[PDB]
mmCIF file of C-alpha atoms and ligand atoms in Angstrom:
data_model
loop_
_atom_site.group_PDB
_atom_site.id
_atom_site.type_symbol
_atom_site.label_atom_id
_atom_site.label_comp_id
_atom_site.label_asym_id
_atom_site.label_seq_id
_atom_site.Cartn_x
_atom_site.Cartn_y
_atom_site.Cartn_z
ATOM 1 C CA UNK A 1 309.232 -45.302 -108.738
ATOM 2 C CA UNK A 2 310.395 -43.228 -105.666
ATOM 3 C CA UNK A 3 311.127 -46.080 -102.947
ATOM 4 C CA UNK A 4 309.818 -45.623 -99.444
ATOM 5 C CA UNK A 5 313.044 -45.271 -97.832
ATOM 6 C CA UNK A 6 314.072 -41.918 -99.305
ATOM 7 C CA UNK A 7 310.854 -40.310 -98.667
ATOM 8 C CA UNK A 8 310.361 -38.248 -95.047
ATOM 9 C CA UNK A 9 307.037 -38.540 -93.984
ATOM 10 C CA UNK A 10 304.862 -35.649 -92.721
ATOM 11 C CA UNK A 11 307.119 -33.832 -94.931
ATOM 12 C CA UNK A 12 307.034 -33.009 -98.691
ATOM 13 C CA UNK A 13 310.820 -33.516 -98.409
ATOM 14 C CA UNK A 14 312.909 -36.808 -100.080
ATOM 15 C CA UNK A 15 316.618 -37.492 -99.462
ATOM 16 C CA UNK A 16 318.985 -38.775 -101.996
ATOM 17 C CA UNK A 17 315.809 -39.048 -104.684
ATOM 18 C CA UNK A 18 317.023 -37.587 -107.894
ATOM 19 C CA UNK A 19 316.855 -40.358 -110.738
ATOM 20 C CA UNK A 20 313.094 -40.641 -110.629
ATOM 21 C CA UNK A 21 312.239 -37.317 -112.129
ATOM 22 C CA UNK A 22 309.343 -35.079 -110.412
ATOM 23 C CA UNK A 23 308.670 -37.040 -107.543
ATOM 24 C CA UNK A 24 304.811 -35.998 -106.817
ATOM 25 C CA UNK A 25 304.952 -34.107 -104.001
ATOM 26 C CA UNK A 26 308.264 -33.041 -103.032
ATOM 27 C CA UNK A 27 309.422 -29.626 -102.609
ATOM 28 C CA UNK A 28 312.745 -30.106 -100.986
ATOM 29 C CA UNK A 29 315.194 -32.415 -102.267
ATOM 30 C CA UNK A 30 317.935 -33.312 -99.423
ATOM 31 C CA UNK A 31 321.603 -34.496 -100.791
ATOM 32 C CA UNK A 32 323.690 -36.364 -98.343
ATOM 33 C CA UNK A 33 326.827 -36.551 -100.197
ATOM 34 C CA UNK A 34 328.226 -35.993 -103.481
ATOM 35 C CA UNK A 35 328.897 -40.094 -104.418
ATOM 36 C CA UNK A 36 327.315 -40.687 -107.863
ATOM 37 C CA UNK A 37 324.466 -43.797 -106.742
ATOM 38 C CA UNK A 38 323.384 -40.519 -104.604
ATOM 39 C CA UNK A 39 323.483 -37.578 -106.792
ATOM 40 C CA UNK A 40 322.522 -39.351 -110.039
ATOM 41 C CA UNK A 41 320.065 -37.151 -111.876
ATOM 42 C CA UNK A 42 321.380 -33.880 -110.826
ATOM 43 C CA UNK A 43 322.567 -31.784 -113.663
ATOM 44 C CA UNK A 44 322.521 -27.834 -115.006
ATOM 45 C CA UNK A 45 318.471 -28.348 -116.336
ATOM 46 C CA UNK A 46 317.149 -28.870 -112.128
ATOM 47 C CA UNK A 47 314.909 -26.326 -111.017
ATOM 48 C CA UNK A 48 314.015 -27.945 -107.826
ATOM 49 C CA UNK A 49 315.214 -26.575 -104.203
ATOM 50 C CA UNK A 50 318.469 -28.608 -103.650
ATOM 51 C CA UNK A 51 319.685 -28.851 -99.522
ATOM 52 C CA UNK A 52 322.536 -29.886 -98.645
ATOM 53 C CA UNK A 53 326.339 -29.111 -96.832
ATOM 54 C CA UNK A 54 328.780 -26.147 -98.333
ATOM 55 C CA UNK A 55 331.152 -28.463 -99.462
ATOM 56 C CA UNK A 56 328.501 -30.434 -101.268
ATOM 57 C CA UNK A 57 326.976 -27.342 -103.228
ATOM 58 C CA UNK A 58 330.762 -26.469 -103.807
ATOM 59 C CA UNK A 59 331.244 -29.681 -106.136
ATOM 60 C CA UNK A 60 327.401 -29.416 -107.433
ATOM 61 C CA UNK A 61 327.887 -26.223 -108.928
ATOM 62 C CA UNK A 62 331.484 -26.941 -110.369
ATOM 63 C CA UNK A 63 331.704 -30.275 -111.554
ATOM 64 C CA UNK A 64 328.170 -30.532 -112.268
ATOM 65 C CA UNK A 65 326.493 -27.416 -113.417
ATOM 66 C CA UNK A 66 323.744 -26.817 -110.603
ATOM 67 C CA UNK A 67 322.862 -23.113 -110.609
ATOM 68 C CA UNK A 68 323.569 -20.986 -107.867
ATOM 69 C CA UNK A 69 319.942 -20.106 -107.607
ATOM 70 C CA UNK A 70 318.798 -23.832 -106.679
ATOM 71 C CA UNK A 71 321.823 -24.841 -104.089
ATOM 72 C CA UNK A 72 320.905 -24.244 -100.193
ATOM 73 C CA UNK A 73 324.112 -25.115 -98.385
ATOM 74 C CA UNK A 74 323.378 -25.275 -94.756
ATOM 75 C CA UNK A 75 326.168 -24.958 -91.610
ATOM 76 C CA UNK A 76 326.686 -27.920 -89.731
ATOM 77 C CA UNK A 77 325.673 -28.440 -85.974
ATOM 78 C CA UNK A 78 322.874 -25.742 -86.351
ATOM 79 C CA UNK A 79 319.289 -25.866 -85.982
ATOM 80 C CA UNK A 80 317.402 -24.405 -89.457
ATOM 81 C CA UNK A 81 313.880 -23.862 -90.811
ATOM 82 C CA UNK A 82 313.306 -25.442 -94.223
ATOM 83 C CA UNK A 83 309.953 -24.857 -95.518
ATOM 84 C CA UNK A 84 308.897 -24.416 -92.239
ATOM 85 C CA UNK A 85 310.313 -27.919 -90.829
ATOM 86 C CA UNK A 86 312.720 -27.276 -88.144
ATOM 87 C CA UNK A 87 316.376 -30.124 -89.552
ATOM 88 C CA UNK A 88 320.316 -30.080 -88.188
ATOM 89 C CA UNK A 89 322.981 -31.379 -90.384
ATOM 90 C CA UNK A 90 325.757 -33.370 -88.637
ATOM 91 C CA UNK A 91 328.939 -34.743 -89.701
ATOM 92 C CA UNK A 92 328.638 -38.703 -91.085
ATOM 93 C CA UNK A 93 332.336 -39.345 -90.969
ATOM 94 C CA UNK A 94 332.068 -40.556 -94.641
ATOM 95 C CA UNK A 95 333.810 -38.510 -97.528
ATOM 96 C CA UNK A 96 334.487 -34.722 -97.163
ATOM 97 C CA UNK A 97 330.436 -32.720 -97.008
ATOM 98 C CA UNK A 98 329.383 -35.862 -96.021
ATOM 99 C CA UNK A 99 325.940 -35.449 -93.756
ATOM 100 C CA UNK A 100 323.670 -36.795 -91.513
ATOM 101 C CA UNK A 101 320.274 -35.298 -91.284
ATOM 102 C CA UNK A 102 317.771 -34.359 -88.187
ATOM 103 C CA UNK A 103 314.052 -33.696 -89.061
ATOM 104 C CA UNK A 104 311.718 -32.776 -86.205
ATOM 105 C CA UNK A 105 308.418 -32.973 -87.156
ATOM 106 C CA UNK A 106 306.013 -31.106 -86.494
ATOM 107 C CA UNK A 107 303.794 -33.814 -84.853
ATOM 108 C CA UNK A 108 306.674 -34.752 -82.058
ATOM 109 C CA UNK A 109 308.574 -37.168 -84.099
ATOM 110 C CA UNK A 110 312.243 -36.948 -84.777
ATOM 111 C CA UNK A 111 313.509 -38.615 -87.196
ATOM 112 C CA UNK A 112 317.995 -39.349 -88.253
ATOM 113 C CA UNK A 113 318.793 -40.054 -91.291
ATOM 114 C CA UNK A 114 322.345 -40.875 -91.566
ATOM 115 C CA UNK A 115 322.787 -40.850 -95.558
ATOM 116 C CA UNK A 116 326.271 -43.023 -95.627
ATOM 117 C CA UNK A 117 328.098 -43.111 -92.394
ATOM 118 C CA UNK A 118 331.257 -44.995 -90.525
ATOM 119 C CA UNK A 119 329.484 -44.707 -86.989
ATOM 120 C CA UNK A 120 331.934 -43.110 -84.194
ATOM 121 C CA UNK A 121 331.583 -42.687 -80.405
ATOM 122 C CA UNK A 122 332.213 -38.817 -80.838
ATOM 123 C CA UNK A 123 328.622 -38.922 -82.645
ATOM 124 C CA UNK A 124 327.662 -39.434 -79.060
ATOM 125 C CA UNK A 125 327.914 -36.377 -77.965
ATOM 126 C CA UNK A 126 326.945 -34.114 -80.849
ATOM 127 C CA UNK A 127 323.379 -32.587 -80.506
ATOM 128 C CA UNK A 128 322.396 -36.344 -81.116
ATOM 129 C CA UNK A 129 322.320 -36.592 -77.062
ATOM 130 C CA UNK A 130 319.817 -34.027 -76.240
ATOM 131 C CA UNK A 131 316.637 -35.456 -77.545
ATOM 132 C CA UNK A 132 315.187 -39.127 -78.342
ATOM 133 C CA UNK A 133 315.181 -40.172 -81.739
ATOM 134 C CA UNK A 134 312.109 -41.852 -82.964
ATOM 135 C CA UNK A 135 312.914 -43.595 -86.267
ATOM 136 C CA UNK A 136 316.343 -44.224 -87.771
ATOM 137 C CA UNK A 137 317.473 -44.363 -91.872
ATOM 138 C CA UNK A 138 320.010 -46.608 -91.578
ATOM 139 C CA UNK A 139 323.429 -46.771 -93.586
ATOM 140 C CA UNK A 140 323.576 -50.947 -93.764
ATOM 141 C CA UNK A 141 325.886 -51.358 -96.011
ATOM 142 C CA UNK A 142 328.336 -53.654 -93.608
ATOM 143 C CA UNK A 143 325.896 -55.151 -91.335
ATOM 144 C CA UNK A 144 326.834 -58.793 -90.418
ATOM 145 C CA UNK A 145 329.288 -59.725 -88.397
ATOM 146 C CA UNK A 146 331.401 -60.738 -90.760
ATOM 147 C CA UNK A 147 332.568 -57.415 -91.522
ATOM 148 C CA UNK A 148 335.488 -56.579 -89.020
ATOM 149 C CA UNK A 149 337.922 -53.648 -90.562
ATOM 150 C CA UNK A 150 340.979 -51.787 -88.734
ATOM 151 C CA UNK A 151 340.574 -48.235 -87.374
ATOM 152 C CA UNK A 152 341.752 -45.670 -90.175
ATOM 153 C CA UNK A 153 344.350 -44.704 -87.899
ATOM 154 C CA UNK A 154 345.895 -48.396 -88.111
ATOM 155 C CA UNK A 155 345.640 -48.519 -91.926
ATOM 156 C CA UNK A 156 347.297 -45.143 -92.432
ATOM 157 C CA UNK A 157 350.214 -45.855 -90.214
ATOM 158 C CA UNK A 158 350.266 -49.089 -92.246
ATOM 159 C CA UNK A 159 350.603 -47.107 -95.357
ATOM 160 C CA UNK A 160 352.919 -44.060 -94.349
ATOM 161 C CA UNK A 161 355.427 -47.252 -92.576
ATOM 162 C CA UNK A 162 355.587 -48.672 -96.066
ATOM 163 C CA UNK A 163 355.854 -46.729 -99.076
ATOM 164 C CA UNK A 164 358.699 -44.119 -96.608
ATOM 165 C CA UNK A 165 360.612 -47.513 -96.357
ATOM 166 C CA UNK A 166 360.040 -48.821 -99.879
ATOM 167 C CA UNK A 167 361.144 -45.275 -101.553
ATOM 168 C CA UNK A 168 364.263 -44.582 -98.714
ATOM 169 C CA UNK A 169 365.478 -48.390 -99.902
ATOM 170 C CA UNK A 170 365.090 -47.026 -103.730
ATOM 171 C CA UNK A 171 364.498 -43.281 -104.754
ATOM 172 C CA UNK A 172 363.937 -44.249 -108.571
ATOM 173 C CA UNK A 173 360.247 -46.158 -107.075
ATOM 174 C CA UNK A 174 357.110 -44.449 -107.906
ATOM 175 C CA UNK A 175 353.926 -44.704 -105.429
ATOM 176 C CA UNK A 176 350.665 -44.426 -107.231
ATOM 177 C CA UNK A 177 347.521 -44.408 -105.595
ATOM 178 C CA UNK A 178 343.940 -45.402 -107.083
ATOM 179 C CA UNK A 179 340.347 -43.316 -106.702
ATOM 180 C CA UNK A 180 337.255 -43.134 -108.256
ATOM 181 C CA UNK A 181 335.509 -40.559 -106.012
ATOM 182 C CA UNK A 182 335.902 -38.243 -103.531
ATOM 183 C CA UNK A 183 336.363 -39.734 -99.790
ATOM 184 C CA UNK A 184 339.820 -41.425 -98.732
ATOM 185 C CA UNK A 185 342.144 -38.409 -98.963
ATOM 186 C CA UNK A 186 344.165 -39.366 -95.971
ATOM 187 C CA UNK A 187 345.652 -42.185 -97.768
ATOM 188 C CA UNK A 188 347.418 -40.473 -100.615
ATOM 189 C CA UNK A 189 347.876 -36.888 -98.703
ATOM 190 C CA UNK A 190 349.732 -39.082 -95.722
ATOM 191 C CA UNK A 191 352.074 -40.786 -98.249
ATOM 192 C CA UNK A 192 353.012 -37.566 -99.847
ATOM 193 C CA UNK A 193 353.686 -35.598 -96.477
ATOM 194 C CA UNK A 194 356.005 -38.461 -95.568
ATOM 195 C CA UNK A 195 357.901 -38.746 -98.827
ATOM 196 C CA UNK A 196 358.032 -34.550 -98.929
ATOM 197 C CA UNK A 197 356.276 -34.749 -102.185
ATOM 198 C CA UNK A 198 352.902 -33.057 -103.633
ATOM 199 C CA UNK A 199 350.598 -35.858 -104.479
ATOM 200 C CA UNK A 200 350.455 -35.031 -108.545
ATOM 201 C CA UNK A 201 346.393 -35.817 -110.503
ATOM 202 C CA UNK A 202 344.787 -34.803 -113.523
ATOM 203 C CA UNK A 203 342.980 -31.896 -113.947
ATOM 204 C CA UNK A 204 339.656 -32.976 -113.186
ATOM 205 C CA UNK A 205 340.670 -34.482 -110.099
ATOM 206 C CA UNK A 206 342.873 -31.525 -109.260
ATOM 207 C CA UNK A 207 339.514 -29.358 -109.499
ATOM 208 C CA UNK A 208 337.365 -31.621 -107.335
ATOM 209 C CA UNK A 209 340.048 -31.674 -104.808
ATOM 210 C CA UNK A 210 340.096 -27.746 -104.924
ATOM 211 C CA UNK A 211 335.768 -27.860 -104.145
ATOM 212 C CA UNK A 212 336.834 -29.515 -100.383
ATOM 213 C CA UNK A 213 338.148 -26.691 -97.744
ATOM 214 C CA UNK A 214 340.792 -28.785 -96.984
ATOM 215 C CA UNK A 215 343.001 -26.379 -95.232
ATOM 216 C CA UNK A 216 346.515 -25.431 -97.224
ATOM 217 C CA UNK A 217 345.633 -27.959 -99.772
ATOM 218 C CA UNK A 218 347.434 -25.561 -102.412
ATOM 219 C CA UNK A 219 350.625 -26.885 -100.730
ATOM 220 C CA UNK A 220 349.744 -30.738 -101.075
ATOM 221 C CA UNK A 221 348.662 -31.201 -104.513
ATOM 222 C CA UNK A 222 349.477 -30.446 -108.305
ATOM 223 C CA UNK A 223 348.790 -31.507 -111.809
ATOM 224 C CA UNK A 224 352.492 -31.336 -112.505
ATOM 225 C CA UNK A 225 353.340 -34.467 -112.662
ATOM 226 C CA UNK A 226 356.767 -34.493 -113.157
ATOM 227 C CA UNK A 227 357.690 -32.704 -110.377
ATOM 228 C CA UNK A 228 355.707 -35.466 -107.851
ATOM 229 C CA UNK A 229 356.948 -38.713 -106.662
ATOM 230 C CA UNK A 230 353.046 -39.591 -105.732
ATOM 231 C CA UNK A 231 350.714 -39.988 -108.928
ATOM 232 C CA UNK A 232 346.930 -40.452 -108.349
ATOM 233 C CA UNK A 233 345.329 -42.617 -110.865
ATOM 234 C CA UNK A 234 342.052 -43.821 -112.203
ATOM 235 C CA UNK A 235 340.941 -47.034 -109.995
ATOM 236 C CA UNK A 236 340.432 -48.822 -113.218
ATOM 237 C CA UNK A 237 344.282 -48.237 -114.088
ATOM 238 C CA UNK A 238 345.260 -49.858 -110.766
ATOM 239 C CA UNK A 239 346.055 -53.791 -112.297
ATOM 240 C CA UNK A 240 349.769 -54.736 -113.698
ATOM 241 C CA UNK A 241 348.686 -53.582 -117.741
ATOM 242 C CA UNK A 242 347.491 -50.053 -116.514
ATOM 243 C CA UNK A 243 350.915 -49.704 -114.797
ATOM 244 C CA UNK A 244 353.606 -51.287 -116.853
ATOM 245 C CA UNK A 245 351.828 -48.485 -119.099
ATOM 246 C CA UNK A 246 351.969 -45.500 -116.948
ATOM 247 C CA UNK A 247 355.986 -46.363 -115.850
ATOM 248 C CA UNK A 248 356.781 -46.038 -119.942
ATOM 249 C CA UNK A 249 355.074 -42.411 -119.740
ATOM 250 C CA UNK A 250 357.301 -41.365 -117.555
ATOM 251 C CA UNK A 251 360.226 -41.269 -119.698
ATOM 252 C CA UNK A 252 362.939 -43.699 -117.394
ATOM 253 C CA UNK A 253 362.713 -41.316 -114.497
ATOM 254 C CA UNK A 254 361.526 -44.464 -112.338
ATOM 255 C CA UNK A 255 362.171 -47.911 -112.232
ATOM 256 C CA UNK A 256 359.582 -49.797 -109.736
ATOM 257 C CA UNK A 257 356.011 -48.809 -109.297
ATOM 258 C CA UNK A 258 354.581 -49.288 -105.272
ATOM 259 C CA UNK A 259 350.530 -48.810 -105.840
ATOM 260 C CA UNK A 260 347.646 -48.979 -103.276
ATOM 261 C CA UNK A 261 343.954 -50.025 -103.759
ATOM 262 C CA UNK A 262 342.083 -48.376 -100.773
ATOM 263 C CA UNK A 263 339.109 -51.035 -101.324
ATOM 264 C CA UNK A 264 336.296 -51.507 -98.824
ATOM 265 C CA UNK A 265 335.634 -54.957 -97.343
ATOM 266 C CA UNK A 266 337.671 -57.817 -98.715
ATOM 267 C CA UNK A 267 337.465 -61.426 -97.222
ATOM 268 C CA UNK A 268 341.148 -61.440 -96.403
ATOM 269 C CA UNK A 269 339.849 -59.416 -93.219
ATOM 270 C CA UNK A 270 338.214 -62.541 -91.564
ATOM 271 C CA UNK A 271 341.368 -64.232 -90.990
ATOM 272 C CA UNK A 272 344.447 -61.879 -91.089
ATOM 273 C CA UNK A 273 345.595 -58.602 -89.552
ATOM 274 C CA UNK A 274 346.474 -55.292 -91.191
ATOM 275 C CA UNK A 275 350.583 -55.587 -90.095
ATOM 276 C CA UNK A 276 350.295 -59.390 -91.749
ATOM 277 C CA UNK A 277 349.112 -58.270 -95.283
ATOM 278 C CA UNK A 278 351.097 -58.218 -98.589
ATOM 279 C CA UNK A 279 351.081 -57.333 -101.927
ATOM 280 C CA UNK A 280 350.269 -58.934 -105.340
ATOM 281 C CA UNK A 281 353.168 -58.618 -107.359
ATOM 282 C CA UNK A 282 354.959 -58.775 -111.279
ATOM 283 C CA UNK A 283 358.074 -58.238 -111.822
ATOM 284 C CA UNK A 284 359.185 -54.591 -111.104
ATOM 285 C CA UNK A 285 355.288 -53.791 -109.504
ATOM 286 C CA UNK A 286 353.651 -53.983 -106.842
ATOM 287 C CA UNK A 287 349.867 -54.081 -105.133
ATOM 288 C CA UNK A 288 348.668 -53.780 -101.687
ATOM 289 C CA UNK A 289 345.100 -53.727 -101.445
ATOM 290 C CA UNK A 290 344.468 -51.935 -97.806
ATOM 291 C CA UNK A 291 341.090 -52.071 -96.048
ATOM 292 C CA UNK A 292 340.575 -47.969 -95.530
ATOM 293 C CA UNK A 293 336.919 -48.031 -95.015
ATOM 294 C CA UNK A 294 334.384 -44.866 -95.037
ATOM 295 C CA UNK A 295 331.530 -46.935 -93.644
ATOM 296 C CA UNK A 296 330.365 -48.375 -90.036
ATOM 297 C CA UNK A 297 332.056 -51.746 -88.983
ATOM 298 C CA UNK A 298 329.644 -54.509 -88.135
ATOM 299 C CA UNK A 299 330.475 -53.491 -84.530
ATOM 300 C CA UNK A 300 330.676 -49.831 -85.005
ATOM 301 C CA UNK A 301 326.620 -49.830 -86.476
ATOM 302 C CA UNK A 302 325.719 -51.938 -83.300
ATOM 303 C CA UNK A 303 327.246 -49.905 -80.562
ATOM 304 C CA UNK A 304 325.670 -46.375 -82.557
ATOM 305 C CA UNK A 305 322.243 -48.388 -82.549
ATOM 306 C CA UNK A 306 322.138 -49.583 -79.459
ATOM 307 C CA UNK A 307 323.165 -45.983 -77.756
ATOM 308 C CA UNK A 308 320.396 -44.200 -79.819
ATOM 309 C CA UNK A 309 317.889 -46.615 -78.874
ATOM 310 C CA UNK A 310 315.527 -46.128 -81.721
ATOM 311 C CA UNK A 311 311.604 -47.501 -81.977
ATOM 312 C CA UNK A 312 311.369 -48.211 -85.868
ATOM 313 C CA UNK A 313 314.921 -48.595 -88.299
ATOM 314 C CA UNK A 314 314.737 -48.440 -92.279
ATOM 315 C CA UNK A 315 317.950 -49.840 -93.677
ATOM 316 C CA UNK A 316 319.122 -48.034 -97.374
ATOM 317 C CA UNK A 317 321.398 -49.948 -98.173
ATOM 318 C CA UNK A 318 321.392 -54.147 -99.621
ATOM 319 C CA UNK A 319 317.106 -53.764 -99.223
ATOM 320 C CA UNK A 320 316.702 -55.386 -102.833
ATOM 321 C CA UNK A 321 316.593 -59.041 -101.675
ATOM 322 C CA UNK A 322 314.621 -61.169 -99.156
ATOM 323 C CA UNK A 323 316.894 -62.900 -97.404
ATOM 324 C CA UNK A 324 318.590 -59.658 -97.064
ATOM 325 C CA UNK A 325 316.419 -57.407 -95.183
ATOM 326 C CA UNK A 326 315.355 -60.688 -93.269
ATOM 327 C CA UNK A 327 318.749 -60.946 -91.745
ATOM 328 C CA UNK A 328 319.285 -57.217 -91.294
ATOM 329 C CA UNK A 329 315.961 -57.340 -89.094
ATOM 330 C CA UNK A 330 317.304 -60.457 -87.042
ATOM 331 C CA UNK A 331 320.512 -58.314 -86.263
ATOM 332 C CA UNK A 332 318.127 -54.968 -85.269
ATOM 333 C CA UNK A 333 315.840 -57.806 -82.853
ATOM 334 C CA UNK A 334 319.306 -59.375 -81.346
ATOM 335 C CA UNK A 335 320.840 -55.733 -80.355
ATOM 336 C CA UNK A 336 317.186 -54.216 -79.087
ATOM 337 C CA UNK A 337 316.752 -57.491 -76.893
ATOM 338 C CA UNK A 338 320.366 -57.167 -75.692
ATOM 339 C CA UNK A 339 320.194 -53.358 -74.871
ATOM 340 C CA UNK A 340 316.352 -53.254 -73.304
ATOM 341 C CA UNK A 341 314.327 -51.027 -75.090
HETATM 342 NI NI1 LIG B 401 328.854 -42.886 -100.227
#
């Protein structure tokens, strides 16, 4: 059944709540982002009011069959009436549509919701800072302080550093890059602007891309592949088998294969630093395994937390075992005695 945690109360609305059929009582459904453990159930047979960002209705109604008539894409940063409850959709600085959502309920409460989220000081002063926030839905996926990750920034300047110097050393290596979903863009578009190369997909990644707004995208990517020194692969395909394959495919016109993993977390993080890392490697391949991460650092959840100041946080995420949610609400009673409220 419907869990607690996606439903909004004094509300019929639920977020991220479509894999449990009719949910008694609902007549909103709020989508967050288009990542498949959050979508699942939507297909071209719902006839309930979907709400969610442009770029997520974009990708709803081409890749999976929503009709127009049921998508409500909202702006961002802007206060709107949904069946007569006054929400704001803010930028989660997860993949691209990605959202955060503000309820204010018609008793006084406001609640955040921040769907998935990599927690940022510029949230700080968003329309976050001009009212108190009663209750938080918390993105926990990374919360223990074991989870330390580099700044994008630093793991992109990694990547752009290496494969330029591993391709100006030989011009017959290919750099393939593996995904599984939309988010993590920067790593294969920042490769392929520093090689002068359009990154080079199959079709139905080449279509998703298209559903984005990313500004002149129609000069970055193609699903020619021969004419791209940057190939975008299935995640699965990412391991020595999958690659020794895809170099015979392309017909002797490259002779060493440079590949990244963007992964999340990986306990090589606890001990060394993103300039000390290397690659796995057979033969003629190579694979780096990079930490680009799309959600909040241990450190990055506390400082949001503890600048919001909540009364009452729901985690969503690792809530299915004891010794889970008991730790999670250790680290909530740590940071609220730190911080005073
Ligand atoms: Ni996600």
């Amino acid at each position: 059944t419907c869990p607690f945690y996606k439903k909004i109360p004094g509300t019929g609305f639920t977020v991220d709540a479509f894999q449990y059929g009719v949910v008694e009582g609902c007549t909103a459904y709020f989508l967050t982002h288009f990542h498949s453990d959050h979508y699942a159930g939507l297909s071209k047979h719902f006839t309930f009011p979907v709400y969610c960002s442009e770029i997520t209705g974009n990708l709803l109604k081409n890749k999976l069959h929503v009709q127009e008539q049921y998508i409500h894409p909202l702006p961002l940063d802007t206060e709107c009436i949904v069946n007569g409850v006054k929400v704001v959709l803010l930028d989660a600085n997860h993949c691209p549509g990605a959202v955060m959502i503000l309820f204010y309920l018609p008793n006084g409460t406001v609640i955040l919701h921040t769907g998935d989220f990599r927690a940022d000081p510029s949230m700080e002063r968003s329309l976050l800072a001009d009212q108190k926030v009663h209750m938080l839905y918390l993105d926990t996926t990374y919360c223990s302080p074991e989870y330390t990750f580099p700044s994008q920034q630093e793991v992109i300047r990694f990547a752009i550093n290496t494969a330029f110097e591993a391709v100006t050393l030989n011009p017959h290596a290919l750099v393939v890059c593996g995904t599984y979903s939309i988010g993590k863009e920067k790593v294969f578009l920042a490769i392929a602007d520093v090689l002068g190369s359009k990154v080079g997909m199959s079709q139905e990644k080449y279509k998703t891309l298209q559903c984005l707004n990313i500004p002149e995208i129609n000069s970055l990517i193609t699903t020619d592949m021969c004419s791209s020194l940057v190939h975008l692969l299935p995640m699965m395909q990412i391991n020595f088998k999958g690659l020794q394959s895809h170099l015979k495919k392309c017909g002797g016109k490259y002779n060493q294969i440079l590949a990244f993993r963007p992964t999340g977390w990986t306990h090589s993080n606890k001990f060394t630093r993103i300039a000390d890392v290397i690659p796995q490697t057979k033969g003629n391949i190579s694979i780096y395994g990079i930490p680009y991460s799309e959600h909040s650092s241990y450190l990055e959840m506390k400082r949001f937390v503890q600048w919001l100041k909540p009364q009452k946080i729901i985690p969503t995420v690792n809530v299915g075992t004891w010794k889970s949610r008991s730790t999670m609400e250790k680290y909530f009673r740590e940071w609220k005695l730190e911080a005073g409220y």
